[PDB]
Design a protein around this ligand. Structure first.
Ligand SMILES: *[C@@H]1O[C@H](CO)[C@@H](O[C@@H]2O[C@H](CO)[C@@H](O[C@@H]3O[C@H](CO)[C@@H](O)[C@H](O)[C@@H]3O)[C@H](O)[C@H]2NC(C)=O)[C@H](O)[C@H]1NC(C)=O
Ligand SMILES: *[C@@H]1O[C@H](CO)[C@@H](O[C@@H]2O[C@H](CO)[C@@H](O[C@@H]3O[C@H](CO)[C@@H](O)[C@H](O)[C@@H]3O)[C@H](O)[C@H]2NC(C)=O)[C@H](O)[C@H]1NC(C)=O
Ligand SMILES: *[C@@H]1O[C@H](CO[C@@H]2O[C@@H](C)[C@@H](O)[C@@H](O)[C@@H]2O)[C@@H](O[C@@H]2O[C@H](CO)[C@@H](O)[C@H](O)[C@H]2NC(C)=O)[C@H](O)[C@H]1NC(C)=O
Ligand SMILES: *[C@@H]1O[C@H](CO[C@@H]2O[C@@H](C)[C@@H](O)[C@@H](O)[C@@H]2O)[C@@H](O[C@@H]2O[C@H](CO)[C@@H](O)[C@H](O)[C@H]2NC(C)=O)[C@H](O)[C@H]1NC(C)=O
Ligand SMILES: *[C@@H]1O[C@H](CO[C@@H]2O[C@@H](C)[C@@H](O)[C@@H](O)[C@@H]2O)[C@@H](O[C@@H]2O[C@H](CO)[C@@H](O)[C@H](O)[C@H]2NC(C)=O)[C@H](O)[C@H]1NC(C)=O
Ligand SMILES: *[C@@H]1O[C@H](CO[C@@H]2O[C@@H](C)[C@@H](O)[C@@H](O)[C@@H]2O)[C@@H](O[C@@H]2O[C@H](CO)[C@@H](O)[C@H](O)[C@H]2NC(C)=O)[C@H](O)[C@H]1NC(C)=O
Ligand SMILES: *[C@@H]1O[C@H](CO)[C@@H](O[C@@H]2O[C@H](CO)[C@@H](O)[C@H](O)[C@H]2NC(C)=O)[C@H](O)[C@H]1NC(C)=O
Ligand SMILES: *[C@@H]1O[C@H](CO)[C@@H](O[C@@H]2O[C@H](CO)[C@@H](O)[C@H](O)[C@H]2NC(C)=O)[C@H](O)[C@H]1NC(C)=O
Ligand SMILES: *[C@@H]1O[C@H](CO[C@@H]2O[C@@H](C)[C@@H](O)[C@@H](O)[C@@H]2O)[C@@H](O)[C@H](O)[C@H]1NC(C)=O
Ligand SMILES: *[C@@H]1O[C@H](CO[C@@H]2O[C@@H](C)[C@@H](O)[C@@H](O)[C@@H]2O)[C@@H](O)[C@H](O)[C@H]1NC(C)=O
Ligand code: NAG
Ligand code: NAG
Ligand code: NAG
Ligand code: NAG
Lengths: 30, 562, 30, 21, 682, 30, 21, 30
């Protein structure tokens, strides 16, 4: 019933992931 | 005038306020702006720091983990418009994980054209209920606000009196402000598009939000669409060309822009300085015009791209040929479908496979407009050209009237698609022409389309008997090719004041059909007189692992009692 | 040195402890 | 990627050393 | 004697009663009897038709769609024993689709040894509730009776009076009969093994059900085990041999039985005339004895057999090698597992694949006793040597302590197995050694074992705080290696006077672990005093498509409640049976609120009312009614009454009564209940 | 002649209508 | 089999003619 | 919840099938 909240939390987690993925590689260029 | 500063296109600032003085004078920053990761900052590092020079940002703006800052009315007192071409997960304003950030004071912000606003993990921020997003945004239902000081109800975010508009929205008058001083300005119900001036008069038909004088293209503040030399203009007069949906430039400017990648070399089409031409076009050595010719391969990185938002989408805006595979995975919660359609597959071919995994709000695939062919030259593992999983709102794939589908190789993979009934699935197998490929359990025959009765069989009522206390319905007794499989009759009944749309019946004896006197019925006692009822019947039958006899449902009928 | 899967502010503070000084630039092209 | 290295695997200090300059 | 007729092995009769006269004389039919499909018969075709000679049938008996027949008391008055070697979906008596069959009259049937009885689609039959099957059968819960005339309650299946035993079963006395005339015979509770005679005396130790004389092997009716020449015997003396578990035959008999397939040629083992020898054995040209030797292949029809009951099972009874593939499908509802085990896989190998589809009640696979190797030389479609689907009760496959498994080829197919968690699945992958075969969706990772948290992770409680109205638990906050995946805490609680065995909690901030000050907890208010409770906690975490971190559950724990001030001592009755004795009796209070220590009793001497001392009773109007401070007290222990002595005649008494659930420190006691009384005058 | 999938008493009465007279024996071996 | 012919398929009268003698 | 009755009806149907399968082929021998 409330499984939209369950996927909403994963959506929040994905939003957490993507900003971190932006922050992650501008630095390794060697 | 209208913009005395400069452009100074977007570069993002990290680790200290040293590079911030690079972006001082400039009037409207093309691109985006991000400020991130400054732990060692102090509140004293901002009182001698202000930029009223910026009024509009084109694409987006981001604030992430910078300490000591508590407000924004000093750093940007006069930022006014966000256009929002390049978005950020359908947001253009990111306020996130900002320790000590307690208020905004962003009173001069008037319209955000495209995108939304997301606020999260900012346990100091208040003055949040005093912000009418409908004055600034359109799709206010796409704004995510959680984990804040407002979420533990403490802040009395008030203003001393009248000034700030106390407007009824949901339950009562909502006072609208930015700080305890800065009210939220409300233009009247006629100056809504181009904004209003201070006393409330409408601005010029090319202004936007603010104007220094009412009804003056030479005395606006922000242009609606296009700028040219102290005048907000509706289009480019010749010999000028639209650049990035905000101004008119000559041939010399966009010409000399091309000469510097020797990265986005530019051409000109439709009186516009644009990056590239679509398929069937050709450059020009003289003027860089997208000339038509005879015969756009958006070749991916590693032939693969996860697609999740508009930010993923605009990378493939206007493509025609995809030399790769696509992954459709949107843990969404909001229908992006119109804007999803706005920059998607005017294409016909996919070289590799197609994947659709765990997407929630996608009710249809009609945003795929022109798609015909899947080459499938690289398959999904398990030898699939196609994938489908966990789509909680997907019902229709396409209308197979005009939509076509051509599949070279690979197979189909259908699981946990609870409103995707098997009829259109078999139609897809038919129009695909690849019906002689699917093995057992390539379709989940238990979970696909198991939330609404779909398939074919319709009950038809032979006789109707009404009363003020009695209801009897008689219908033609359907019998499947194994009459033993019928186990009962599911009936759904309720009352219906509109027409905008539970008991069981045992199966009677079949035993023959010259005269099968087994027209089945149910007597209802619970009737109110003068009352409209909505009743429909489903046939409860036995599941079989084979091509199961689909079972019948009746029509939603409306019966008004005495 | 933790030997654990890392996300969120745990990973953020870990990255700040690794970087200390400058750590990351933002010149993909310039 | 980031969780591909620090959450799927576990990052090393030498792996994060490229994320120092 | 004991059996005047003959054997006449079982032949089944169809379409008319003409071949029925072939089976008249014979007393015990070896095999089975089926009577079926006679639509052009009459009730007059049975009145001149009777067979009292039959007493016992070995295997089974069947009645199917014969018109005009209404009873069986005439056709078989004296059938008594069903042995049930060859069964029929674990039945031995088929009463099915018999039009006009309204009664049985099967009073002489006494014991059915092995099997059950199914009765269906017989819309005339009654007198059925008057039949105690427990007297005749052991497992009475395997008897399916439906679609009959008794299902529309009309039949008065009565007897005139006493005779028929009216025995209580479930709600009241059940009168036991067969007809309106024939009662159901009940032997007493000591003659149950071998039957009883007419007066009720126990029969001989080799009789069964009935005996003509009490305690006589030469005057039984039916043998318990074996028959030999007017005597029911316990065993075959030499040189005789047990034949089909019912008699003793000489060597020449089973000798010459072999000489007739020149179909079941026979051999001898263990003083028994048997069909065949198991593995490692050899025939004998002299005496057909299963001699041991060095080195039994039951090659199937088409290498394949659907297996659904004992009727399927006994075809592979005693087999050692199966040259084919097996299919296990039992839409059941009854555990046959012991009887399933009793004639199954004393084997190691299956040459082809193995299939298990849609079986319901199979909780385990331990009945595969010696099963070691899967060859899989013919695979299931989809390239499987193994199949599994739709097994609502299957939890354990085997204990992998001593049970082993070797799988040559093929793969595993796991779907819709809601009580089969992935732990023993991967253990079977490990012991099989075939882990480098299975692709994605060879295991349904959403349906298999999704009714109970299984795998590994256990919660451990750090602190317990109890009260009479508060509960706090504290436990170690577990975090999966992605800490964001923890959604919340599932908690189950209930009270439990036995020990033979819902809320949710938000997770706290992880944020560190030098001092992760995040030991999670929940307060319960809904407590009853002195009351034992049973609580356990499960961890709610996010599903992942990969090898998901299995998540934790807590132990079931038992914590009893405290106590409090007990309720009002109910109904104080204060009677004075003497001039100084007052009995005070009472009920226990509504809420003892702990183990009641005693009853605090206060009796207080109420003086006479002071207005009576200054009234002129010599004037007419002389109507006389015939009626801290330490008060005298009592701690009545373990008694709901108290007589009080040393009391005044003609003095009203106030009585304050309380109960007490605590006595030794600081007495927790009830609230005051009051009464008043008066002693008798002297 | 019905053209339909058949079970139960429908199939039973169909078989009796087909057979009429003898129709079926029971000698697998004898 | 029986439902293999009369319920899986549909039996013919010639198929049932073998079920006459 | 009551799905045991659902499979029980199929069990009844299987019991119907098996007796019919017994009745079916003792007759075609040719
Ligand atoms: C903020 O200012 C804009 C400026 O006009 C207000 O109007 C919006 O303008 C945009 C830009 O043209 C419109 O988007 C367009 O939509 C069409 C489809 O209808 C699409 O084909 C174009 O490519 C373009 O994206 C938008 O529809 C329009 N909206 C309205 C309501 O007029 C906007 O309303 C202002 N915001 C607020 C909150 O007042
Ligand atoms: C009907 O008569 C029999 C005769 O004794 C009563 O006892 C049952 O006898 C059979 C045969 O000996 C027993 O079966 C055996 O079970 C063992 C395992 O326990 C197995 O290894 C053998 O192969 C054989 O199958 C059966 O257990 C036994 N039952 C009881 C309850 O004693 C039977 O009780 C009589 N029926 C009634 C309703 O009294
Ligand atoms: C912001 O503007 C000041 C003012 O100078 C104007 O902008 C310059 C870029 C140039 O175009 C001048 O002609 C304008 O009047 C800038 O301050 C100047 O900086 C330059 C060094 O680049 C120096 O030589 C001048 O003397 C400065 N003039 C004054 C009046 O201070 C400043 O650099 C601008 N900031 C940025 C980031 O461009
Ligand atoms: C063609 O356009 C160029 C560039 O346009 C300038 O930049 C625009 C953003 C806008 O601000 C225009 O008003 C500008 O003219 C012109 O080159 C510039 O011309 C101005 C004239 O005032 C001059 O001050 C600048 O120094 C010039 N830029 C350079 C790099 O020298 C050019 O004059 C235009 N040609 C015609 C015929 O209009
Ligand atoms: C049932 O038994 C009667 C009685 O005869 C006995 O059984 C016979 C099989 C045989 O062993 C006799 O010696 C026994 O006394 C049978 O009737 C006899 O049948 C035979 C031929 O079958 C005939 O020659 C006799 O005259 C008959 N005698 C009488 C008194 O009728 C009968 O055939 C037996 N039926 C079956 C199916 O076994
Ligand atoms: C060995 O046994 C055979 C067969 O036993 C007979 O059949 C049994 C079912 C049981 O009824 C036994 O009592 C029977 O004896 C014997 O052959 C029969 O012997 C009897 C002697 O009374 C004779 O009347 C029968 O006609 C014989 N049978 C035939 C077909 O002729 C045999 O005599 C026994 N031999 C020894 C040495 O005991
Ligand atoms: C999926 O199908 C392809 C096509 O048959 C299989 O790939 C072949 O594998 C063999 C040996 O592994 C090669 O000799 C062929 O060249 C391959 N063909 C192609 C087109 O790749 C593959 O094995 C199949 N995969 C599964 C899981 O069934
Ligand atoms: C299952 O695996 C077997 C083993 O490779 C496949 O069978 C082979 O098929 C090819 C051509 O079809 C033959 O040349 C081989 O001789 C077959 N080998 C065996 C052992 O049978 C089969 O194609 C696979 N089936 C599926 C559905 O994957
Ligand atoms: C794609 O579909 C278009 C519309 O299809 C037309 O209408 C349906 C009902 C069919 O009858 C179809 O044959 C008609 O052509 C077509 O215009 C177009 O040719 C189709 N393209 C391909 C490759 O099939
Ligand atoms: C089958 O298993 C039998 C019992 O296994 C024994 O105990 C366990 C704990 C293991 O340590 C195992 O290695 C031991 O042998 C064995 O007796 C038998 O040899 C096993 N057979 C095969 C083929 O593995
Ligand atoms: C609607 C709006 O914000 N208008 C502003 C006004 O408030 C400000 O005072 C002025 C500069 O003085 O610029 C303009
Ligand atoms: C328990 C039982 O049925 N015993 C029977 C008895 O009823 C019958 O009268 C007798 C012969 O007539 O044989 C014996
Ligand atoms: C600011 O940061 C940059 C790069 O992070 C560095 O070059 C510069 O020295 C820093 N300045 C100060 C004052 O910390
Ligand atoms: C009884 O049935 C058998 C076998 O079908 C047949 O030979 C015989 O003629 C029948 N007799 C009567 C009277 O129908």
């Amino acid at each position: 019933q409330i499984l939209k909240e369950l996927e909403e939390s994963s959506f929040r987690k994905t939003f957490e992931d993507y900003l971190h993925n932006v922050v992650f590689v501008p630095r390794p260029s060697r | 005038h209208l913009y005395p500063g400069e452009v100074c296109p977007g570069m993002d600032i990290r680790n200290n306020l040293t590079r911030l003085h690079e972006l001082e004078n400039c009037s409207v920053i093309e691109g985006h702006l991000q400020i991130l990761l400054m732990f060692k900052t102090r509140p004293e590092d901002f009182r001698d720091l202000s930029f009223p020079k910026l009024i509009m940002i084109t694409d987006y703006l981001l604030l992430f983990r910078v300490y000591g800052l508590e407000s924004l009315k000093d750093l940007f007192p006069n930022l006014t418009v966000i256009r929002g071409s390049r978005l950020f997960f359908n947001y253009a304003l990111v306020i996130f994980e900002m320790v000590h950030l307690k208020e905004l004071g962003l009173y001069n912000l008037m319209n955000i054209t495209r995108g939304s606003v997301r606020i999260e993990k900012n346990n100091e921020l208040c003055y949040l209920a005093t912000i009418d997003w409908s004055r600034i945004l359109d799709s206010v239902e796409d704004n995510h606000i959680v984990l804040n000081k407002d979420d533990n109800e403490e802040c009395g975010d008030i203003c001393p009196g009248t000034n700030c508009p106390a407007t009824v929205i949901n339950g009562q008058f909502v006072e609208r402000c930015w700080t305890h001083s800065h009210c939220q300005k409300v233009c009247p119900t006629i100056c809504k598009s181009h904004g209003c001036t201070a006393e409330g008069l409408c601005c010029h038909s090319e202004c936007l939000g603010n104007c220094s004088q009412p009804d003056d293209p030479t005395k606006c503040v922000a242009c609606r669409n296009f700028y040219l030399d102290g005048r907000c203009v509706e289009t480019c007069p010749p010999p000028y060309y639209h650049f990035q949906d905000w101004r008119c430039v000559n041939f010399s400017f966009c010409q000399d822009l091309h000469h510097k990648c020797k990265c986005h070399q530019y051409v000109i089409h439709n009186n516009k300085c644009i990056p590239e031409c679509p398929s069937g076009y050709t450059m020009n050595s003289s003027n860089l015009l997208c000339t038509p010719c005879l015969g756009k391969v958006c070749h991916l990185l590693e032939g693969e791209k996860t697609i999740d938002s508009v930010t993923s989408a605009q990378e493939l805006r206007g493509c025609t040929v995809i030399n790769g595979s696509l992954i459709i995975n949107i843990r969404g919660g909001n229908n992006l479908a119109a804007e999803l359609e706005a920059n998607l597959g005017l294409i016909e071919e996919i070289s590799g496979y197609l994947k659709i995994r765990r997407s929630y709000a996608l009710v249809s695939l009609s945003f795929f407009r022109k798609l015909r062919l899947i080459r499938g030259e690289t398959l999904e593992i398990g030898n699939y050209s196609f994938y489908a999983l966990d789509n909680q709102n997907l019902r229709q794939l396409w209308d197979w009237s005009k939509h076509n589908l051509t599949i070279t190789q690979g197979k189909l993979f259908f699981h946990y698609n609870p409103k995707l009934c098997l009829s259109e699935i078999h139609k897809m197998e038919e129009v695909s022409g690849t019906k002689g490929r699917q093995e057992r359990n390539d379709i989940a025959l238990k979970t696909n389309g198991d939330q609404a009765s779909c398939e074919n069989e319709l009950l038809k009522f032979s006789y109707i008997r009404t009363s003020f206390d009695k209801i009897l319905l008689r219908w033609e007794p359907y019998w499947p090719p194994d009459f033993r499989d019928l186990l009962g009759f599911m009936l759904f009944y309720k009352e219906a004041p509109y027409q905008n749309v539970v008991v069981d019946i045992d199966p009677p004896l079949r035993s023959n059909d010259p005269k099968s006197q087994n027209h089945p019925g149910w007597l209802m006692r619970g009737l109110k007189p003068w009352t409209q009822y909505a009743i429909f019947v489903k046939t409860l039958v036995t599941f079989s692992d084979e091509r199961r006899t689909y079972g019948a449902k009746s029509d939603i009928i409306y019966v008004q009692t005495d | 040195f933790v030997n654990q899967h890392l996300c969120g502010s745990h990973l953020v503070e870990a990255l700040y402890l690794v970087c200390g000084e400058r750590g990351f630039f933002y010149t993909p092209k310039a | 990627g980031i969780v591909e290295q620090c959450c799927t695997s576990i990052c090393s200090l030498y792996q994060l050393e490229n994320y120092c300059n």
